[PDB]
Design a protein around this nucleic acid. Sequence first.
RNA 1: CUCCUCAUGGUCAGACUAUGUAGGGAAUUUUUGGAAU
Lengths: 77, 99, 70, 135, 36, 73, 92, 522, 75, 82
Amino acid sequence: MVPPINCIFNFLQQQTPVTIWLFEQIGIRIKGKIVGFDEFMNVVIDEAVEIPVNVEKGTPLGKILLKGDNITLITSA
Amino acid sequence: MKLVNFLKKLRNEQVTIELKNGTTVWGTLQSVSPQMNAILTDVKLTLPNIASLQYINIRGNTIRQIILPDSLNLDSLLVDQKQLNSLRRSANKRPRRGL
Amino acid sequence: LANLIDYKLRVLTQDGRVYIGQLMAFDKHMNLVLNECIEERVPKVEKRVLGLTILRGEQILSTVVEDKPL
Amino acid sequence: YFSQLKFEGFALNSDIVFIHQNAGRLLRAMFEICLKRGWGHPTRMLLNLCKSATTKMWPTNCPLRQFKTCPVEVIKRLEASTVPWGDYLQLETPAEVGRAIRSEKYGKQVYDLLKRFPKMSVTCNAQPITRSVMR
Amino acid sequence: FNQEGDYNFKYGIPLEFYNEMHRPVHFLQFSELAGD
Amino acid sequence: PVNPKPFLKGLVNHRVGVKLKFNSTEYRGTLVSTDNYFNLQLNEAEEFVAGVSHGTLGEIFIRCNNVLYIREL
Amino acid sequence: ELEELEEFEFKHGPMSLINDAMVTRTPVIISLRNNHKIIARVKAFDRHCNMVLENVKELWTEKKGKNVINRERFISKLFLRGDSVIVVLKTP
Amino acid sequence: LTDGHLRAPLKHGVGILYKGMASNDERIVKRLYEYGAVSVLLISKDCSAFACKTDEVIILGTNLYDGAEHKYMPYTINELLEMVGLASGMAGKVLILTSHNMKAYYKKFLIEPLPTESYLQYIIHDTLNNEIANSIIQSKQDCVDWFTYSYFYRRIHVNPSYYGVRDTSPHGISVFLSNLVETCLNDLVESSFIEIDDTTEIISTLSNGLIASHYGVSFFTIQSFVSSLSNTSTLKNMLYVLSTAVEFESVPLRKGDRALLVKLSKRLPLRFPEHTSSGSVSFKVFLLLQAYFSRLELPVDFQNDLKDILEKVVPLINVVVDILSANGYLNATTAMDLAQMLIQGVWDVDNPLRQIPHFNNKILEKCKEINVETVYDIMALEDEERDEILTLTDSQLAQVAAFVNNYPNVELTYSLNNSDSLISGVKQKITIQLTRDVEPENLQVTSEKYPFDKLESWWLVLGEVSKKELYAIKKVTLNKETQQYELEFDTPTSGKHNLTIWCVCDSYLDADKELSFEINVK
Amino acid sequence: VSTPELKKYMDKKILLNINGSRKVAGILRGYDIFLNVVLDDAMEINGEDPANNHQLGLQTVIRGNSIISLEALDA
Amino acid sequence: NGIPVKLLNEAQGHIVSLELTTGATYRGKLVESEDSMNVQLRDVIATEPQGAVTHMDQIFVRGSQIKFIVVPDLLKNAPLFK
RNA sequence: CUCCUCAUGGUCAGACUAUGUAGGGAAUUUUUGGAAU
């Protein structure tokens, strides 16, 4: 029963792989480790991968700054 | 500075506003709000077959662009707010001059 | 917008639906309250009597003078 | 016309329309003529008259009337208060202006408008260049 | 008017005994003649 | 904490590419500067649409709001 | 002081492209959200990327019952909203 | 076709004449007039000094605008005199187009002689400062006896009503005059120019009055500098302080200069402080200094104003750096850099290469091609490489050569009396040996954008960086090739003290030669 | 900034419907001024028949700006 | 605050209808309305754009997602006529 | 022109209202767009 920013912070410490659902896009979702974030929920994500669902393939992207506006649902995998 | 003030200058001007939805508007600006909400009169309006309307108020965020007359003096209209800011901001030896 | 008060007005929504009603009040966000408001879709066809409605300013496209106040 | 009198019998009102259109003209002419002549008694009074044709009021009606935003009750109160204009102009504290105009409301507005009314701290130092010419 | 009371003074041109500044009551009575 | 703003500052003066939300456009170029609201300026920019090179644009400005993400290349 | 910092940040930031456009009176091309493009000279700008553009040539793409065709028109005095801007490109 | 519009008017028989023109073009106009090719010539006011003998003269308008006054003001009868000397016949003809208010003034004082008066009463503060600095006036009695020599004195006697002395009599004169000089002295002691103590009476001079009086800068300007300048001040603030002065009253503006200043401000490195007035000549001075640092293509109207400013600034900037030295702030370094920028016309960080006369973008790139950073590398270069870099005319090449030659590679060395015995709060003399590459034939400074001639000088600087404290400074004119100079400077408090010496030229940028050394004081 | 009064929904199983016709079910855990929500025992209901347990105890965060609406399964 | 916000706060305790950005219509008793237009609703009958209708006990929808509300006619009397 | 903030003068027991050389109306619930096809 914890604020979402604290939840993101425990993702930060645990360094668990994170799956982000983007906004109005079911086709692709982004994945990788949270190395840091800001007040606007922009996330620096390491070893990130694009995951088109449409068996799943993906593109390795390396280090990424993802803008928080895309964020629909942050998760752990 | 703020271009919305430049729009405020545009009262009684005949313009054609293209909108984000694609709608074309043609009319004389009665006023524009600072929101860039534009109230116009004698407006022919074409949704993407023209409808003729006495008065039309448009929400500013819907405005894509506004095409102004070519006769407009942009040099004169653009420089205002700086002068207004300067106005808001604003010994013996006085006469360098003599007799 | 204050002159338009109490008038019958036609508001065009974001989705293209056309609402018509008396404009009783507004606010900063351009949220409008419309008395005895009815909805028209295609142009009468598909007309419905909604009654007293608020409309959001984020959804509103434009408003025009429809008729005089009651 | 200076006192703002509209009329029922409109013969008078037609004549006063004529005076409305040509009055400030004629008066302004007389003023310029006296100014060319170099006459002191007429020129000041004529200038006041010209001002009265322009702005449609008397001296005893307060200059707050020619503000578009100044309300009616306030100007009535000042007209009836029998107070020199210089004192109101010298008043600074806004609350103190509201107390002076004896209505607490609108006082701040009135003071704002006062600082929008012309006020001049004026000084002059004369000095002779030679015996005839004086700068 | 106050027979013993303080007043500030200045240089200037004095007005007529019957002059517009000295007769303010007359203007309110003059416009009050027609009223409103 | 390593924030997006410091990571981006360290990313300045390096070859980057930016994928917009539309994915209709990606931009690969040197990252000249970024402002506090995160608008992007690139130089020698190249446009990749559908993963193929569309053309070489040059000095380019990217509206912040369109940016999906930025990655270093 | 705050005003100074804002103007400076604007000068050395990404905004420098539209600043450079106004000072040099150079043409820039703007990819918009309507899938239309505006190549013009920047008369004025704003933090929102609201712009007064002169000598506007807008280019667009249209589809018909045969091969896709490009269409274009000239608008001498154009004022533009700030949100329609996808991209502002400066080039030779 | 210089003076971009002088062609079309002159082609139809009306010539144009104004200050700031291309000189050749002006001369062509004048020749046409003398030969009769142009029967009509339109001369701007400031060119009354250029006397073109005419058969007839017309004077159109008696009113010229200055921004500082914020209204048109009529011409001086002096200007009109210089404007009527040009015309002589078959019969001398002078048309003067005037107002009714100014008719009686010109119609009298042109035909009848000019009554002469004295404005000293305005400048008395500065003048008396100067006298005290020269120490001719030891006391107030001495000053009154000094005012006995004034044309002012005679004048106040013949026409006392003009100067505001009501009593007309020997005693009245004496009293009024002593009043004036007393007021003057209070302003000076309050502003720290002097000090007055009872034992007739003793007056002494402080560091402020020294420099102010020596450079001749007016009292009010100095007081303004004092009020604004403090420690930890920036270069922008120093430049503003420079711009606010009374010396710039003589820089004219009509409405266009100010509006164009607004339009120009987009293109400039700095931004005027918000709490002062834009219309004031200070803002214009500020922007024209900006346009001097960045070489903009200026209108020929603004070139003249830039020239005037430059004629004023060198004393002013000297005062700015020295007053900070007197207040013992190590930030005088930045003032020195600004002075260098004024002598040359380039910024410190922007590029050292642009300092060398007549460099532009393309030519600078070749310097990046040969990977040169400082100017000292240009001295080691040989002729073939120089020819490759600059392809240009011969006069410009010559000035560059002279620049390179008189710009010395000078070395900074010190010799301290005792490094072991270091006592706190004692006057510690150092002997700094300075040595120059080439011994000068003459000290002339060469710069294109600073038309007036300058002799080179140097400042020796000692201070500690973290505390922002400047311990010692001295100015030197180095005529010889090698010299020694003794800085008598009090030592800091006990402990370890970093002492960094700069050798900074007043003229040339990127000449900064530094040596850092630390001493332990007891 | 106002805080939504979600305290009545705390520790209750809810069905969030979200942009893109997405629907998830989970116990309400946290929230903030931003309406951003933490859900525990999160279960994605995909378009057809299956549901996946994404976060059983590891929970999840949903952006309040992406939250369309929230149904209370309990009372 | 907004005058329509003030009315909408008066609408609490009444039966209102809500259309969201998706187009689904929720009719029910309005429990609570925040300043941000977030609304808590009871005993809701829901009509989808496809025409299917469902019943739900407690629903809470974000302000930003609401296209519009319809409130009972009782409130039209006052005090918003001024 | 409108809403907010701030300042203010007043009134009531924080709210309301007039005025303002004021600040503002691009980072999640409204006006600087997730829209485009």
